[PDB]
Amino acid sequence: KKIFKPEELRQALMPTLEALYRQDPESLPFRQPVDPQLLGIPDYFDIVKNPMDLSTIKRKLDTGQYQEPWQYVDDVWLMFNNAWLYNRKTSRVYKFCSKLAEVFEQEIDPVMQSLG
């Protein structure tokens, strides 16, 4: 199988992560792990079993925790699916998530074509 070097993945994928961070107001609720106590939603971890957020994805990209590009895509989509699962369709986080997913699909496509 094609082996991806850590810096290869970082150079290719970090710009797609930065594109999500650039989204204001939509990325703000995703820039840090959900804190259910601070946010007053103690049921969060009862519903979301595998939390994910932009800062965790960034740390994983910085520490070589992705061996394949699709593992990175999986974490971004885990973040999205958590927000779509937990939040009501009318909520800001839900609609912001939908916007981030539109941005991400546009950014990741040419990058996947460039990668192996």
Contact positions vs ligand XDM (CB under 6 A): 28-30, 34, 39, 41, 44, 83, 86-87, 92-93, 96
**Tokens found for residue 113:** 């074509």
Cβ 102 to ligand XDM shortest distance, Å: 17
Cβ 31 to ligand XDM shortest distance, Å: 8
What is the spatial distance between Cα 7 and Cα 19, in angstroms, rounded to a whole number? 18
**Cβ closer to ligand XDM: 42 or 114?**
42
**Cβ closer to ligand XDM: 21 or 44?**
44
Cβ 54 to ligand XDM shortest distance, Å: 10
Residue environment code for 15-53, b if the CB has 16+ CB neighbours within 10 A, otherwise e: ebbebbeebeebbebbeeebebeeeebeebeeebeeebb
